Amino acid sequence: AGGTKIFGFWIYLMSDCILFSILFATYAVLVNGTAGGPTGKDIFELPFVLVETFLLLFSSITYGMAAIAMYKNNKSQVISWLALTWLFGAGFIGMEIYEFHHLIVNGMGPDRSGFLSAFFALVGTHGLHVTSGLIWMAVLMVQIARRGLTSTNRTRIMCLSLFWHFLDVVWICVFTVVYLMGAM
Amino acid sequence: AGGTKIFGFWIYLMSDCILFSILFATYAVLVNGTAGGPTGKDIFELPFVLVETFLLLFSSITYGMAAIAMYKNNKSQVISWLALTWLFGAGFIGMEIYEFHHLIVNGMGPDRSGFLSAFFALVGTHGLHVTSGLIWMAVLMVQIARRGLTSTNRTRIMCLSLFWHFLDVVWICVFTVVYLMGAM
Amino acid sequence: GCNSALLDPKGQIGLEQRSLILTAFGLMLIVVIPAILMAVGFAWKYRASNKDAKYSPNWSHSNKVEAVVWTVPILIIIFLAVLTWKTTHALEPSKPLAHDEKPITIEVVSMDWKWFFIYPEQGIATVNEIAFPANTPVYFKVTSNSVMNSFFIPRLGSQIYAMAGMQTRLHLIANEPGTYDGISASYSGPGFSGMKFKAIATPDRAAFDQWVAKAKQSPNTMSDMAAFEKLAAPSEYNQVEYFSNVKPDLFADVINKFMA
Amino acid sequence: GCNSALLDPKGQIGLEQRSLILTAFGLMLIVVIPAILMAVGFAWKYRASNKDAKYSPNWSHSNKVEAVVWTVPILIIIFLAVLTWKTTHALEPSKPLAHDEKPITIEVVSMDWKWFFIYPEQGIATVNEIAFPANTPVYFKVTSNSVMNSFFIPRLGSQIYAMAGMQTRLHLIANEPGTYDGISASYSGPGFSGMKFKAIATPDRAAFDQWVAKAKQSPNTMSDMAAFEKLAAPSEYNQVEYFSNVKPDLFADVINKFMA
Amino acid sequence: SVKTYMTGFILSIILTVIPFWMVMTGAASPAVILGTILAMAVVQVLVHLVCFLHMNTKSDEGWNMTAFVFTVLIIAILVVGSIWIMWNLNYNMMMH
Amino acid sequence: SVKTYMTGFILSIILTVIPFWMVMTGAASPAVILGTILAMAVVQVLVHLVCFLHMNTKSDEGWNMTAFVFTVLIIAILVVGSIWIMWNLNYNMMMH
Amino acid sequence: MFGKLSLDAVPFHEPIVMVTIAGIILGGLALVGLITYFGKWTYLWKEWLTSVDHKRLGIMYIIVAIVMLLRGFADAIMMRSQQALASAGEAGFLPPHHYDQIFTAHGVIMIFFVAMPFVIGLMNLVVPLQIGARDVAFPFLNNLSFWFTVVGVILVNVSLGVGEFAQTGWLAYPPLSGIEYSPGVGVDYWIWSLQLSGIGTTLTGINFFVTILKMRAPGMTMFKMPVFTWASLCANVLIIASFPILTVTVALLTLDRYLGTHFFTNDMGGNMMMYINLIWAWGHPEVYILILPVFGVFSEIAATFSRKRLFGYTSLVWATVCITVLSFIVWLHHFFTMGAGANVNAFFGITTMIIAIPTGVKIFNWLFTMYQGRIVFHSAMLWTIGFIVTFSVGGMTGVLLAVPGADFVLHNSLFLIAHFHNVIIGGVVFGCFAGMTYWWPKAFGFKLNETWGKRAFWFWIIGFFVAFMPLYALGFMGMTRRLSQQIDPQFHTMLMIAASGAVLIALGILCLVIQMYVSIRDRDQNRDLTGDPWGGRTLEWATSSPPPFYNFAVVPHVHERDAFWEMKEKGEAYKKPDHYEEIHMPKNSGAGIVIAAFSTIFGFAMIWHIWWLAIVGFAGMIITWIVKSFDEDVDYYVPVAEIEKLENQHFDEITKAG
């Protein structure tokens, strides 16, 4: 039963891979779109992106430890690891929201240029994906606290593992293409 | 037992297909090779090639009738059809030898130009192939007359069928590429 | 239609395109006609009613039949693809025509629900009309002042798109003098039906010079962007108009309006 | 070799070729070095003598290992193939060099077991020696009077073939003035070892004009095909020779000898 | 059977007669007179193989056909490659 | 196991630190600074998938992997196609 | 109540839209009245409105597709009448402001809400039965997908009632559909309708792709499935790999329209061309999603009615796989006239021409399936023969259009409309009606009236020829698409002939309705007793003509290609199992309709800029999803008694009929 659901979620992640590849192509076409506006070199702070990358990687490792603990048939360990993963994810989302607020207030919003619009679209799509993952972690933790480690709960944890690791892979591609290559 | 021998002869014919394709490529490269000498339009007589094609096709049909007669377990019919096929093949070889003699005597031999050399090579290779087929028919008929329709004889007849039909296919390609296209 | 716009063209490009259409039609017929013929033949000959018809309820694969089925389409596609490559590389609108006469440059700005044309060498402007001498190459530089449009003269030959802040190149030559219809092949809005103009292929140069002189006598002038914007007001079924004085670089300014 | 002909070149084309060699070397090392290291590592660590080594006599497939094995070669070949395409399209010998100075045309006829050079613009001929000013593009038109040869100056850059009745184009520029060795890279017969010449990249133009004037003082002249054929006699280890007067179209006549 | 051989013979007669008659009379544009004769030749090639040709066992109907298909791909590589390479090598040595 | 996750974590730290340090300092030619970071990213992409990513059943080890491979070919078609088409479409509309 | 919505949003003045709204609302009121009078509200709620069951959702897709076909064809009639009147130098009765709305709405409805619902209906109806499964992998996901499609349909219909619809064509090209040139709310209707429909279709694709691979009957290998299952798997692969492109493209356009970004604007460095590429990157796979399953249907029919085994099974499956692979590298053939380089145009032309070979192979396999078989002239077989004849000409015109040289003058001309309508009517709707008449007994337990079916088929084919053959000539004459006013009189005659064709197709549609009515009226005389009306090869015909909510009492064991045909040949087709076992089944869920209602509210609020209502709708969707994620009582167990009773009833029917 779990196998079919996990395979279905894997096919959904492949669909989501196509979804993100289209945004990547759109950004690549509109990378030089900006006219009389800020460029990649002018606004991208590399230390901020490095801190974001390390915190999301810490989130991935903590969730992995949660999956190992679930294989170890322990509830408290899984709850603690999920809490730490959610805290790291919340920190990452906080930094992304702060960066977007700073860009918008300084009159560099998505309505300024094609380049800024494409940048906002891609990073925003990743942001909504990560916040969906965070809401899923919240509902999964409140379900574990009142139901325990059941077959359905194990299947949900495996699906969320696939989702979270996929998001980290997408973020690797994002910082490689958008942030790091732009600031070159 | 017959299956393995027939399959082996089929693979040999595929090797021979590669052999003839190399000569075709060589002729195609050296088609305009002739310098201060006869061209395709100047020497190719289309009626002669039409008579050659019809006589070789008659050879193929008669040999097919021989194969049908062999399936009908009749000796005399197979002998008669093989004799008629050999006569048609001998006629075809006669016309080819006459054409080569006429070309050589008129000072248009293979030592005159690249085009004439390539033409001689391809048509000569086909000629030696057909005369090998004729010698094979001669030995096969003299074997049938003194041994009858045995398993070995049936296998040899099938192999010679494959060989002869392959030669007719090669001649179709030859008159299409060399004779008919040249005279265009 | 025997007397159709595409099957009886007046331009050269039209003639090669018609020849290509007919050759393609011929090549596809050799496979399509047998398909329909065999469909009707097998429907009629092998119906349930017939008793003499051969019944084969276990013959479910044939190597010969499969080989024949696969081969002929492959060969037809190979020949038509070689023809496609040759024609596509030989009928690119962004390619100058091979002719003795020097090409005449026409700039085509596509306003909302109307057509605007500029002769920079002659220094004149027209609305919903063009003119050029017969048997002379014509070089169209096409852009859109607004929403995407499609410059198209069916009889002369190939069409092209007009997009904001982008210049697209096209070449057309007329073999026979006369009047030809020109439309838009891209829906631009309510007044899209309105977009209609006439191409006059004059018998000789002298008629073209007379037409240019007549356009030069227009009281109206297009010297500034303000006049261009005043004309560019949303209007429907605009009549043929003429403008004597034209800014040396108007097409450039129209493109640079969108900073591209 | 650090001070090698190819790893310490003096020509531009040599410099891009050395850079390309080093980049390719670097890209292939990232996969090759681990292969040899793992070979030695698995030979030593997992020998029959070791008892602590993990034994897996049924682990015969791994999806992770197979994915890793397939992926890295594919990526390395993709990057090096993109580099290969760019460099190959940018280092074609049949491509004029981008430089301010006008290229100097040298014709290279490859006689049996010797090298012949013609300066048509300067109207001089040489045997087993060339000269050209430094930081100036040189345009070689190379053909063979006989059996296939290979024109090659290792320090300057790329080589080419010399074939009977066929002109082949090459471009070379020298960044540093001096004397460079030139050989044949195609075995032409017993005297193939003999084929050796010197390329003199003069510090300035004036030295090149002095060399041209010195060649002009040669008592010998190459005005007719009879003199060319007399020189073209089979000879071995031919010394450096000069010829003052040259037929305006000698290279053309040498090619047309084979009617091509 | 005799029927398939007779059908092949008739199709071969037609696909040999038509190209010969077309070329000897110049009944069309040279492009058409080339394309159509090549098409009829390859069909006529297929005609002889489809009818006259027969394999006794029929046992490796999958196999023998696979061998035939592979023998083609190699020819389509070698001939086209040689023609293309020599076209390029002849275009790059002309006195220009 | 914990071992494979820790190994993945260490490799991820290295493959994230090196590109960042290289870009911020301009330690090489821009061509190298692009090629090497792309290589490390795709390796680092593989690193996360090889170690952190893990399937429970492992049952369709043939299948799940086939799905992953196909999802790539489509991306390599769409992204490269879009970039190439837009490069050509932008080169053909410049004021020349 | 807030935002752009007001008393001026409803068109009081325009009579045509008001009489259309009156017709729709009186129809709805009459249907509600009839349902209330018969008191079938409860039955529909527990058995139809909220059913995980695949057969019910399939039948409901068929119902939605049929009812939307009427609106689509009404728009077609109105456009054809307007063109005919405008050709005669008359002002006509449809202003451009209404004609643009009509053709855009017609395109959107007939592509998204007529073809796809019917095709996915057929998939839900037969695919789980054919593979020998009891249900789909994700039943609740299937129910949610149905309700999302219904939400899209509701938004498109209510667009007429309040505000207006998009006037930018059925694909909404960027510069016209931008906020600068389209200030109306129609483009928002288009955006949100297609977004929610796309989400539904993506979920459907994932569901079917998992179901086909994972829940096959034991002993049925991949190369032993019926061809329709192969075609369905290929179509679902295309859906999964394609629909994200549409989702992202529409999301980018709505970001441009709402937050004033510059993705596709003509200024501030926006690249408008990008949108076209992206939409066509999604556009061309979509059409194969419409054409792959129907091919399967015809294959199935070709197997059933020729009374012989299907020809070239391996060739057919390899051809459909080749079509699936090639349908991603050909999209640029939509805009050769954009002005891309000769290299790109030639390459895309060649690769678009290449995909023709597998379709030809499939047509020839069907022809040789009819070669030496006993053909019965049933409605389905007539549909198949008509499909072959029409689709051959359609494909011919298509490969002709795929050449860039021909495309440089035939692009956006009525030749293109003749092509796409020709191939759609030939393949999609023909396969739809063929499947509907072929699988009707497996959905209701009685057969369709053959006389009315044959009349409808003849009317459809003759009407289609008469209506669309003149469009080829008009395309040749240089008349372009989407012309409304002052049409050149030289195009009058052909258009008049087209008008005649239109009314012929109308009669066909009327015939179809009458057929269904009489088929419902005389159900007691045309019942399918044995469960095998036409002697079908596949497992679906093993069950009773009303299939139980559990497809099979015992999951069948398969050893060969045609399972049911081999079972009949061996003489073990109807054998009583020794004992029946308790069957695990999923419960009916009511959360699908709640999520659908919340999504409808969210979409409507987004269109009319009612921000608080949109937030309420989105929060409602997420809260309903989270709440349904809590409860665990989602499945139950069917006892041995009920299974034994139904099986005994079915076997008694077999014995009495046999």
Ligand code: HEO
């Ligand atoms: C059912 C719907 C559907 C399907 C499956 C197809 C599939 C095809 N389409 Fe039609 N298309 C369809 C409906 C449309 N197509 C379109 C766009 C479109 C365009 C671009 C429009 C333009 O250039 O202006 C071309 C050239 C064609 C041609 C074809 C071809 C060659 C195929 C092929 O994939 C299949 C063709 C079938 C064949 C070829 C079978 C016949 C062959 C036989 C029997 C063998 C004979 C052998 C040979 C011909 C070699 N399609 C559009 C966009 C309209 C718009 O712009 O809004 C629509 C709606």
Ligand code: HEM
């Ligand atoms: C049943 C008979 C049908 C008729 C008589 C019909 C008629 C028409 C007409 C007249 C047009 C406008 C063409 C023009 O611009 O001049 C049109 C457009 C269109 N039709 Fe249909 N149609 C029919 C069925 C279908 C079906 C079944 C579909 C889809 C599966 C479909 C899809 C379209 C599309 C996509 C357009 C283009 C809309 C646009 O240009 O924006 N049609 N139809």
Ligand SMILES: [Cu+2]
């Ligand atoms: Cu298409």
